[PDB]
Design a protein around this nucleic acid. Structure first.
Lengths: 67, 144, 55, 72, 143, 138, 101, 102
RNA sequence: ACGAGACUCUGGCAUGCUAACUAGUUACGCGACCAACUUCUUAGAGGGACAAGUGGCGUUCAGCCACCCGAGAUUGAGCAAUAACAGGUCUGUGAUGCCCUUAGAUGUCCGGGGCUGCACGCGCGCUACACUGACUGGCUCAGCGUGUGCCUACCCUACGCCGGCAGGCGCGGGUAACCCGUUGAACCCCAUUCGUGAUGGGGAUCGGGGAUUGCAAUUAUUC
């Protein structure tokens, strides 16, 4: 399964709430900005966080999400 | 403008080279050729009769890989299973008295000779002679 | 006397000529790379020697 | 339990089964071996003799199925 | 590619009486000292080819092989091709023939029984003489 | 001034030394279709007749072919022909002819650019092999 | 000859690469031609042992590993310079061997 | 050696010899009849093809017409649409037997 | 807050990067018209994959299924939560708490019976059914790894005596990407072949040719 754990989910939520300015819709740009503005100690976890950030950006482009 | 002897597929190339070496007519095989098993992986004896000729050309190519050519590296081309009853396998080879007799029949042919440090070496003059023969049988009556 | 008995026919494969360098035990010897420890003593000292578990 | 076939070469009987191969729609060593129930190597020898007669051309060789054809 | 030889419904070589059903020249199991690499070596020494038709092969080649085996020591050909070599009672390898004689001499068990040895009983009972293990595996030999 | 990525697959390889000259194609180090194993000649016959002589009329090729394994060096010859053609047309003429002819060759079949990632896996814990286990008694 | 070789061996790659970069930088500070670091295939030492001290339980094994990484750098300089560059307060674990061959 | 088109038999025995239904197990027990089902044709046709692999083998296995020489029959087993096969009519006997449950 | 995940190691991918006199090479190159700023192998600071894109199911949430693209789309292992068990180990350890035998010390000394039986009392093991199994020796094959003094007297191996090759003796190389070795009595293939299956097709013992040299081997070594 591909269920994201609390680590990547919470990191994505914080990154979106705090740097909503810079994040977009592209995985590559989200990856680069996530690497810049956060100290993610693993590259797999960084990629997972960036992917969930892209997913949540799509979510919030279509309305408000509670997290 | 300079022909390599490894220019055609080696089946017919060694076939024609052996045809030349048997057409010289001065060399007849001794009586210790086929009754030797050499290695176990075979079931039969040499039957082609040009086995000596192939051994020498293959040995030349072996150098086209490295100096001091010897038979075990030459015979490592086909490995895998060798089920030998109640004992595990080995790694192919032949016989050394066969090699010595082939050397006794090989002197005066300028094809393959030993060296002073252990192993074999190439005879450049005979090399050029066989290159010329192969090239001028290729470019006279094989591609016109 | 002493030389009439000792060193007559070579024992070329003495198991009792080897012992663990930590506890002087006969069995479970690890002679590879020159450890010369029994396997239990090696497991105790594996990390200090430099052998570590990866796979 | 191999069958019994007439293999003897005679003044008459020899020239009665050698001109029966081209009397069939499907003429291959496989068809002859499965239908006329004689060794397929005999049919291979027959086609080799046909090649010796000079009415076909040999292309490739195999222990079971050989290639002999014509372009005329 | 034709031969005027006539098919023979009865053929006789070494007075054997066995069921002739299959082809020949490698079902020579009735013949004791021909076949495989040695027969190949002899035939290649005779300079003959395979340009004829299989199925109908006569027995002259193997007759020539036995003829050369009648005097094999003259040409100094590698002499590890006979069955029982370096046996007692002779320093050479003599001739024998007929079935019902060879299978016994595959086990020359008179002197080894006379010497009062375990080897005679090891061989006699149909069991091991070298020690093939016989309790879970190694049960073949009587079935 | 060094444009080479040669031709490899699985275990074998072939150094694609592609240079401008007279323009004759050297393949197999031997005549075209007589390879001694004989098993897979016809796959080599697809592109050389598909594309044409004029496309490969200037390609002087010198390849060191090695490696045992049919599926390795075979189909690596086709990977090498496609890739050498790609690099030649890219660095010498343009990109449009490259995309056209390369598209033809790699749209004939996909398996060129991708080899099997399958490898023998480790003998595992308390068993004869990777997954098989020794027989358990009770 | 003036061909001197330095062979660097350690069980870890971080310190070995740090030492290699340090020595390359030092040989490039002076105007010296240096053959780039050449990496040996890093032979791996394996010792597989039963986990149990007794012979009881499921047959479980430890798979111990020890990897030795070997690099050699070639440059042309007399012995005094090599002796000076060695005395750099080296980090532990990187065994340095210098041969004048 | 053909020159003409083998297409007729080449298609017309096997590639619509194919059956139309196989069966499945019923309830939790009882090995005396089987509930008739089907699949989108691929699985049933190629199950007939697999039983035909066994059948053509046994037509070679300990038999006279061997492997590497059944090319006609294999092209039949390959191409397209009509009915003459054997293991497929075995499958069709099973077809009717299990189809009596509709 | 642990455990799970993350993590570490390992595979799989570079018309990319860092460079190698042990792999690899360009028209003032020969032994041949009759000193490429490093890429196949080796290994490093990096890159690459995220259910990321699309379609469909899902209080349109978590997510699931499929499909392009792709080297790769639940991808080998290692590590692994207190309470647990009178689980095993005192025969791995001057790691360790004392009720307590014997002189036939559970010390030595190529020394020395068995267990290498055969009505089996049980358990782990040694093995493929046909043109696929194996020979023509007629084309460049694999490793994963090991290899010589604190102890110590024991390492891996490259030609000839020559019956037909390990090899009883002289001989060099390698503390090793330098030698064995581009792994020296091996593919699975094949002009020794099976025409419909007891034949050539895969071995029930068990005998000779010189035996690697281990007092013994038979009361376990050796084509």
């Amino acid at each position: 399964g591909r269920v994201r754990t609390k680590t990547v989910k919470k990191a994505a939520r914080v990154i979106i709430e705090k740097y909503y300015t810079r994040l977009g819709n592209d995985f590559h740009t989200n990856k680069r900005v996530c690497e810049e503005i956060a100290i993610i100690p693993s590259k797999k976890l960084r990629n997972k966080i960036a992917g969930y950030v892209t997913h949540l950006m799509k979510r919030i482009q279509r309305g408000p999400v509670r997290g | 403008p300079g022909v390599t002897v490894k220019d055609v597929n080696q089946q017919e190339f060694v076939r024609a080279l052996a045809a030349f070496l048997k057409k010289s007519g001065k060399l007849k095989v001794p009586e210790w050729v086929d009754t030797v098993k050499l290695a176990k992986h075979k079931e039969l004896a040499p039957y082609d009769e040009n086995w000596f000729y192939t051994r020498a050309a293959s040995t030349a190519r072996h150098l086209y890989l490295r100096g001091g050519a010897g038979v075990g590296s030459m015979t490592k081309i086909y490995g895998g299973r060798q089920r030998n009853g109640v004992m595990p396998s080995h790694f192919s080879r032949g016989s050394k008295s066969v090699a010595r007799r082939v050397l006794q029949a090989l002197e005066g042919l300028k094809m393959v000779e030993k060296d002073q440090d252990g192993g074999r070496k190439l005879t450049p003059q005979g090399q050029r002679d066989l290159d010329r023969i192969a090239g001028q049988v290729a470019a006279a009556n094989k591609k016109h | 006397g002493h030389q009439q008995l000792y060193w007559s026919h070579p024992r070329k494969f003495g198991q009792g000529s080897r012992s663990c360098r930590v506890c002087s035990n006969r069995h479970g010897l690890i002679r590879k790379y020159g450890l010369n420890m029994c396997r239990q003593c090696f497991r105790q000292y594996a990390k200090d020697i430099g052998f570590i578990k990866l796979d | 339990d191999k069958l019994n076939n007439l293999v003897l070469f005679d003044k008459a009987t020899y020239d009665k089964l050698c001109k029966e191969v081209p009397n069939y729609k499907l003429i291959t060593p496989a068809v002859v071996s499965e239908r006329l129930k004689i060794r397929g190597s005999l049919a291979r020898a027959a086609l080799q003799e046909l090649l010796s007669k000079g009415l076909i051309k040999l292309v490739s060789k195999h222990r079971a199925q050989v290639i002999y054809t014509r372009n005329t | 590619l034709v031969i005027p030889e006539k098919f023979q419904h009865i053929l006789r070589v070494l007075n054997t009486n066995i069921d002739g059903r299959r082809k020949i020249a490698f079902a020579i199991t009735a013949i004791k000292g021909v076949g495989r690499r040695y027969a190949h070596v002899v035939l290649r020494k005779a300079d003959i080819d395979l340009t004829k038709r299989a199925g109908e092969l006569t027995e002259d080649e193997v007759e020539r092989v036995i003829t050369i085996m009648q005097n094999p020591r003259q040409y100094k050909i590698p002499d590890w091709f006979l069955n029982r070599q370096k046996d007692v009672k002779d320093g050479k390898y003599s001739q024998v023939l007929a079935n019902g004689l060879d299978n016994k001499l595959r086990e020359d068990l008179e002197r080894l029984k006379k010497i009062r040895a375990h080897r005679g009983l090891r061989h006699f009972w149909g069991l091991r003489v070298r020690g093939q293990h016989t309790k879970t595996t190694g049960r073949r030999g009587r079935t | 001034q060094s444009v080479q990525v040669f031709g490899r697959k699985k275990t074998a390889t072939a150094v694609a030394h592609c240079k401008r000259g007279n323009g004759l194609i050297k393949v197999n180090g031997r005549p075209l279709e007589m390879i001694e194993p004989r098993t897979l000649q016809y796959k080599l016959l697809e592109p050389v007749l598909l594309l044409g002589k004029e496309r490969f009329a200037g390609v002087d090729i010198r390849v060191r072919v090695k490696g045992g394994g049919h599926v390795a060096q075979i189909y690596a010859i086709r990977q090498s022909i496609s890739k050498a053609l790609v690099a030649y047309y890219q660095k010498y003429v343009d990109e449009a002819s490259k995309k056209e002819i390369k598209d033809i060759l790699i749209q004939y079949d996909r398996t060129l650019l991708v080899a099997d990632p399958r490898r023998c896996e480790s003998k595992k814990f308390g068993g004869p092999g990777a997954r098989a286990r020794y027989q358990k008694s009770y | 000859i003036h061909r001197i070789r330095i062979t660097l061996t350690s069980r870890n790659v971080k310190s070995l690469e740090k030492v290699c970069a340090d020595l390359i930088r030092g040989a490039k500070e002076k105007n010296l031609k240096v053959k780039g670091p050449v990496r040996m295939p890093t032979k791996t030492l394996r010792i597989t042992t039963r986990k149990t001290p007794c012979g009881e339980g499921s047959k479980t094994w430890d798979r111990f590993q020890m990897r030795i990484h070997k690099r050699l750098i070639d440059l042309h300089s007399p012995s005094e310079i090599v002796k000076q560059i060695t005395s750099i307060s080296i980090e532990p674990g990187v065994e340095v061997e210098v041969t004048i061959a | 050696l053909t020159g003409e088109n083998p297409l007729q038999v080449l298609v017309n025995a096997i590639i619509n010899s194919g059956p139309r239904e196989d069966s499945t197990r019923i309830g939790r027990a009882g090995t005396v009849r089987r509930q008739a089902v089907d699949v989108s044709p691929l699985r049933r046709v190629n199950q007939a093809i697999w039983l035909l692999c066994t059948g053509a083998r046994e037509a070679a296995f300990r038999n006279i017409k061997t492997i590497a020489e059944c090319l006609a029959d294999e092209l039949i087993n390959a191409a397209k649409g009509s009915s003459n096969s054997y293991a497929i009519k075995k499958k069709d006997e099973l077809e009717r037997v299990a189809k009596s449950n509709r």
